[PDB]
Design an enzyme around this catalytic site. Sequence first.
Site, PDB file in Angstrom:
ATOM      1  N   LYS A 133       0.812  -1.227   0.000  1.00  0.00           N
ATOM      2  CA  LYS A 133       0.000   0.000   0.000  1.00  0.00           C
ATOM      3  C   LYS A 133       0.841   1.271   0.000  1.00  0.00           C
ATOM      4  CE  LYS A 133      -2.084  -1.115   3.792  1.00  0.00           C
ATOM      5  NZ  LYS A 133      -1.342  -2.374   4.066  1.00  0.00           N
ATOM      6  N   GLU A 192      -0.240   6.215  11.081  1.00  0.00           N
ATOM      7  CA  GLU A 192       0.807   5.347  10.465  1.00  0.00           C
ATOM      8  C   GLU A 192       2.232   5.548  11.056  1.00  0.00           C
ATOM      9  OE1 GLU A 192       0.766   2.755   8.143  1.00  0.00           O
ATOM     10  OE2 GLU A 192      -1.349   2.563   8.709  1.00  0.00           O
ATOM     11  N   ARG A 193       3.325   5.082  10.431  1.00  0.00           N
ATOM     12  CA  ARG A 193       4.698   5.225  10.982  1.00  0.00           C
ATOM     13  C   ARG A 193       5.236   6.657  10.924  1.00  0.00           C
ATOM     14  NH1 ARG A 193       4.618   0.615   7.731  1.00  0.00           N
ATOM     15  NH2 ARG A 193       5.108  -1.320   8.665  1.00  0.00           N
TER      16      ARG A 193
END
Lengths: 51, 51, 509, 86, 177, 456, 456
Positions: free
Chosen positions: G153, G179-180
Amino acid sequence: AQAEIEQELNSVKDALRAQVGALAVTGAEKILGASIDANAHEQLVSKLAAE
Amino acid sequence: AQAEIEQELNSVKDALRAQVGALAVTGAEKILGASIDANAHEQLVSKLAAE
Amino acid sequence: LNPSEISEIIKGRIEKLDVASQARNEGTIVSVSDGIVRIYGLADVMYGEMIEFPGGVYGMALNLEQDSVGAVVLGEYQGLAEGMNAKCTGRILEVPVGPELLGRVVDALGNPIDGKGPIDAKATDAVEKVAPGVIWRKSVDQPVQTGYKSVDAMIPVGRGQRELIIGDRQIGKTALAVDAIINQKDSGIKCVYVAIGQKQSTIANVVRKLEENGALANTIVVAASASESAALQYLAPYSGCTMGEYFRDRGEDALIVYDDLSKQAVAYRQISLLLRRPPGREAYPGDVFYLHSRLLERASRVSEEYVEKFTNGAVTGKTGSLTALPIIETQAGDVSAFVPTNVISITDGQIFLESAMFNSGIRPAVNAGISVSRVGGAAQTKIIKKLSGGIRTALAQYRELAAFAQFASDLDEATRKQLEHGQRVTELMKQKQYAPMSIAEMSLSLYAAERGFLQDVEIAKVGSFEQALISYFQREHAALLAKINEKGDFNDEIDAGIKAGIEKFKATQ
Amino acid sequence: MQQLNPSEISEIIKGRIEKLDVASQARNEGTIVSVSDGIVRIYGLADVMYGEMIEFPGGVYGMALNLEQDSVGAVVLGEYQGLAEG
Amino acid sequence: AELTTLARPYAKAAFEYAQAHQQLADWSAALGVLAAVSQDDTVRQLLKEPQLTSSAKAQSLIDVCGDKLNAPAQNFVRTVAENKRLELLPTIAEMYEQLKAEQEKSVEVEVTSAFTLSKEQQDKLAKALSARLSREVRLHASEDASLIGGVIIRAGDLVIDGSVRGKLAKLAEALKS
Amino acid sequence: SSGRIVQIIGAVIDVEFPRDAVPSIYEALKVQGVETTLEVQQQLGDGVVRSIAMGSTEGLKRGLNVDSTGAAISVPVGKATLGRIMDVLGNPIDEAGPIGEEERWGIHREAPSYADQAGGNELLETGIKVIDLVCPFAKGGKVGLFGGAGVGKTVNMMELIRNIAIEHSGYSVFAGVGERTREGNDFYHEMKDSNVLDKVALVYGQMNEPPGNRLRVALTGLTMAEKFRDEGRDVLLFIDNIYRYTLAGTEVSALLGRMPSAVGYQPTLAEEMGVLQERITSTKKGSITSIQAVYVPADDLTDPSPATTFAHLDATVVLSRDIASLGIYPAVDPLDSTSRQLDPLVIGQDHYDTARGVQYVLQRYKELKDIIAILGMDELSEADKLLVARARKIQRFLSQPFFVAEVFTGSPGKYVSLKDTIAGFKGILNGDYDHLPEQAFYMVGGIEEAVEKAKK
Amino acid sequence: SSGRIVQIIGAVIDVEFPRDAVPSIYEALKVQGVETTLEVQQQLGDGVVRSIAMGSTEGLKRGLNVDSTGAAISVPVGKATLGRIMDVLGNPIDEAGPIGEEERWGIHREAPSYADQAGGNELLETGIKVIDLVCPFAKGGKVGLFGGAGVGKTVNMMELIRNIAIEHSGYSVFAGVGERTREGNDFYHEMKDSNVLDKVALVYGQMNEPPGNRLRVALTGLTMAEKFRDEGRDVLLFIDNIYRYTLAGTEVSALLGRMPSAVGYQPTLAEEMGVLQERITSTKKGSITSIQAVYVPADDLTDPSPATTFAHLDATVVLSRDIASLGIYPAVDPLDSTSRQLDPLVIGQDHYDTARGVQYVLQRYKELKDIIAILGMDELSEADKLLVARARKIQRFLSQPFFVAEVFTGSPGKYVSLKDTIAGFKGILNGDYDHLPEQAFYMVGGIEEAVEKAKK
Ligand SMILES: Nc1ncnc2c1ncn2[C@@H]1O[C@H](COP(=O)(O)OP(=O)(O)OP(=O)(O)O)[C@@H](O)[C@H]1O
Ligand SMILES: Nc1ncnc2c1ncn2[C@@H]1O[C@H](COP(=O)(O)OP(=O)(O)O)[C@@H](O)[C@H]1O
Ligand SMILES: Nc1ncnc2c1ncn2[C@@H]1O[C@H](COP(=O)(O)OP(=O)(O)O)[C@@H](O)[C@H]1O
Ligand SMILES: [Mg+2]
Ligand SMILES: [Mg+2]
Ligand SMILES: [Mg+2]
């Protein structure tokens, strides 16, 4: 048609600007349930200038 | 090209109507807020007592 | 841009102001959470009654507890607050009705969202009603042509029937129902399309396709998009049903499409959980079956006596009807889910769409083995009834035969005859979107197959043969097609007429 | 906070206004508070044992299965539709 | 569950005993004292302690009220404490007065106007309401400058609005809708 | 005396009455002004009763006065009910005016005692090949038509009504429970046009009606059948869907304050079913022959509702979606279907051997079907190849066009007799028709027509 | 006026205010001693409101004073946001000083009306073969990238960000939702070194953040995109993972007193999704082209969150772990992926027939998988053997080395035009490449490179 609306709009705007006072006094007279001319024309000339 | 021209035309009348209606209500509020005093309650509280 | 006109329009609302006193029943808002409002003091509120809040916001009474009233907001609730007054209107939920709604896009309460002006309807009706009883109905024996030969030949739909469209995501469920609405522009049947939980750009694209195909002037579009209150999405099918019932009760025919009853069930589950009602089989309310059965039993055919009684003798000797095309979405083909199980058990038939057939290029993707119509031959014209008898069960047996004889050595003539015929009817049932066929066009296609004329034609040429045959009969036999299209009648003269034309076609083109 | 317990009915509360110690005077006798789906809730029977048999009017019998802090939950050993509150 | 749902059995039991023994005014005073005393910042704290028994909480509340609680009312306080319901005393008093008012065919009506109304007007509104409702009416008249003119009547859940503010709101909604 | 509505939540309504005047369990209540009836399900205590409304709740308000009737829902019974259409409360739902009633019975009753049970084994012919072969019925017994959605429950019930009800000289009761209103109209006009209506009492509670109606219509139809049985008559009782009685209890169970059991069903599933099913019985006084259609949720016969129903029936007929998906009708499964009457001491050894013979051939074919699909037909033994051909022919000879299915099939309807059915299946088992093509047995009544179809 | 904290449970806080000063739904509040921001979710009654903290609640206690701000969370909008990094509350988090904002907008708004909708169908070329063939994108439309953990993704989104910026000349808005943090640092420095940063607005609320931040970051980024759309511009709106907005809602739902729905999800799942998704649209004023990554919990596409998202998109790209396991990247599934633009009236008959031809071959190959697994390819018919050989070549030709994936393998990236894509697959379907070996199609960009790879 958009160009005609842009050119003609101020002509109707100045007509409704005059009718606001008639709509306001007739509406207040309906709400009051009695004659209002004796206590509304001096209000119209002093308040309508802000609309 | 014809129905859509009438679609815009009537929508502009409604946009104006929405502002004129607000001004007419404000006008009625300012008129009644000056035209009403002790001489009005003898014609309103008395009216409600029959309703 | 007409002055004075706008003034007199405003004077008309000022002239008719309700200046008299009114006796009302009232309450106070206690809490505001997730579209749910709790109130104290509404002693005479009835179940399902409309509640009036400050600034013209409206709600509906659903929980009449001993000490509190639980209401759902019919719009945006974030403007409401604790201490606001809640009032009571002695009226049940009503919506505008009549022919003035044709060619318009409206919300779940009947307000116009197309910006094409006001709807000058002269009649309102209740959103929640009970369907006409056993004695007032009449048997379904009139057709509703969808324009697709696979549906109109094997799974026929009649005036007053309820036919479910069911499958997985992105396989033509909306395309089948919208093409069925487009085909009614000349049939004399009024249409209603109800969009529940769809994005507004998808709704606008369906309306553009109805307009480009000339079907919008005969359709009412009811929209309850994905951002609207769960109450409006829950009520939209009933509002659309009420608009369709106007024609049924007056001796006229109507068709209604519910693009997603599974989204209406999800909206009802949300409200019910927020009202703290105890959950069932998949967190769904206990009465989720009754949600859909109360809606779908209204789609019916009513007798001449019912119409004569409803219209006070103004309409006589005419039956009225409302036909429904509800849509349901399944997850990876799973029909065991609670909502799909309920709806398949209510309708007068179903049309199953299969993703494997859709990927294999059979684009109408109708599984003939699983799909069925409970009205059958009574919903077909004489010509299609005779030319389509046994095709559905013959295809169901061909699919099994093709799998059983796949790896076996060469079989008898009975087996080769059945297999070669099933392959040709399988290729014939394929059709394109936005391309409906008349009774005569479907009839020529059915006749050329069942009378054996396709036996010499290659499978890869069946589509080209059908298209050329129709185009030839349209130029050289136009008077015969016009005779078949009057009522779909059939006799030895028409049978011989079609035979002579197909023979001359194959022998010379 | 917590919902009404089975002993929180006006006839029982009104009895403690007359005689505060109304219960425990007849530890072998109680009154039916509610009846539903073959289950009967009774106020009293302070000395009923778990699994003991209870006698109701009309020769109907039940068995004591829930000895709660405020009431006894009993199941009918026959037809329950003839039993009533009080 | 609302506090009104939990207080109903207790308010009804207290009302029926008071009615049957002709003590309606005594229980009206007793429940009012308990409702006020249990709301005091020091008593409210004492009733919430986890180390005290139900009987210790009941006796402390009875010793503080003393003279105002007869033997039946003391027995009622000990019953409310045993069932762990002492937090409902203000709601029990409120519901008891509603049962009493409905029994004594009495209605308390709140009234608001833009500016003061005469005793002649109050007595005209009182006879009209008593003739409509078929009950004794107690007009709690007051003023609210938010009203442009006229008066508003609030007879419990029933509201009758004859004010100018209500008419202006009807016009705003009529034009906006 | 009278009570007041205190709370309304969906179809469930709470009513408060004086403590000295609480109405009994199952007692009927009437709302003042509004045309609605309530049934007491529970006595909650403190004078409050919980009830299910026998009509829609949209008009109801808290504080409406309610009158206690002193008894349960009471419906008209006897000869006056024949040739009439009625609702759950026994009101006429046809335009034919008031019912000529002389007696009314309450819908709640005790089942007949252990000493009152009947013992008859008189075989009943149905005219349907599969049913007469593997599922023989008996007079005064209970039959269940199990199946999912769209496999033939109503159609098989209509063929059974045609082949039994019309020819019968006793009274019949037809109860439409949670049925489509269109099926009820078609059946009424069918009984009226066939001149059969004077022998039948019709009770209808369709899917558009409130949960209280669908929860009690089965008891109304059964109360009319019990009046005829107790007069010494032989009666026919038809129920289009008994699953709808269980579902109405599931829809209302959680609002009645009951914790859910497995698969989301009411905890009272087995008792609510037993209280109803034990009244549907033949006694020493008179007999009730009954046919019930049983819906199977998601085609799963292990679902608690279908699974609890099998033990209440004498004959169990199972309809299969996999057979219906192959165009074969009636779509009956010979391996899963069964009857208490399939005994050599009740019928005969010739019938029994033919039935077990057909079952043996079809059971062996079920394991070979998966073999042929991966490795092909040529890898089977000479005995297996022959058996597979007979199994596919037997599977087709189970099919038969019904008179009530002419609108779906196009071909005319066939009635087949018990002896004709036995002879046809013995012929295919013994090899007398091995030379005929597989397609000749599909939709052809008796064995003669199969020999004729092979020539076309 | 001001209120007092009365209860604290995780990220949810209850505050009591005077009855005449109770704050509105979505109104922002500030705690006096720590300046922590709270957003009002609901009004509980008695002057008490329930709110979600827009930061950590560690160290907060009951009785602290709370100030109502009179408005919702307001963030800076316009040209001043370009080349800057902001948090959920609109504060700068890039150490570059205060934002030179001209105005601020509240993060809560209604979606554009039905009359404001745009009917755009203009094709957008991505330069990626599988996407341009079976999932054609359109300017002003919505795209969704569905996939399980570690399947592609973020890599496939970073490659799309690189390719669309070639033809697009306007502004972009990037919202990082749950997210990260390392990936936000890598993307910021990449654009800063490439001089692309002055045309992109960056908003972050990563996995390290409390539930309130992760729940409202999506609204903050969308509010900046709506300012640029409403100015009459064509803008790109990119979302790191839209599923995190829904998940942050699940963590808080039970604390908000709501009863859970299927598999533990909030009862408001579809409404929370529709209220955000409907704002992400093109109008008659300007256009928003939007691309979103969608996490698929435990590889289950039938899970309520992914299942509810499909209806909100114009193009759906479905990634597979089975395809990624074979070595094929991007790991797209042609049979599950689809687009509204895949229509003969939009893309022309040549493209449409090529795409339909590829899907027919891949579908038929998927049906033979079990037979090939047990008996091998040699038992298939002469027609099936040829189709399986072409299916294997098509499946390999769909692969493509990316300019962002160069670090993983070493191979240089490839951009393939729509013309070259159609020509390659049309030739393989016609049989023009039946002689070339199956490994020549793997990782080669255009069709001519497969011819050169076969020479080795
Ligand atoms: N007869 C047909 N011939 C060719 N293509 C078709 C045909 N019918 C439908 N399609 C195409 O297949 C797709 C079906 O989309 P459609 O919206 O109708 O399916 P759906 O099941 O309603 O999808 P969704 O779940 O998103 O609502 C569209 O791309 C449509 O153009
Ligand atoms: N014996 C039959 N012959 C032909 N078609 C049948 C037969 N039984 C059922 N069908 C078909 O199947 C449909 C479903 O049958 P029905 O009895 O309505 O199902 P159920 O009551 O089990 O839901 C019928 O409407 C008809 O189309
Ligand atoms: N196009 C590609 N080429 C090669 N390897 C890839 C490609 N896409 C993904 N991968 C591999 O899969 C890993 C996970 O990809 P990533 O995009 O981070 O997954 P997701 O975001 O779906 O969790 C990459 O680090 C890489 O090893
Ligand atoms: Mg669709
Ligand atoms: Mg049926
Ligand atoms: Mg990643």
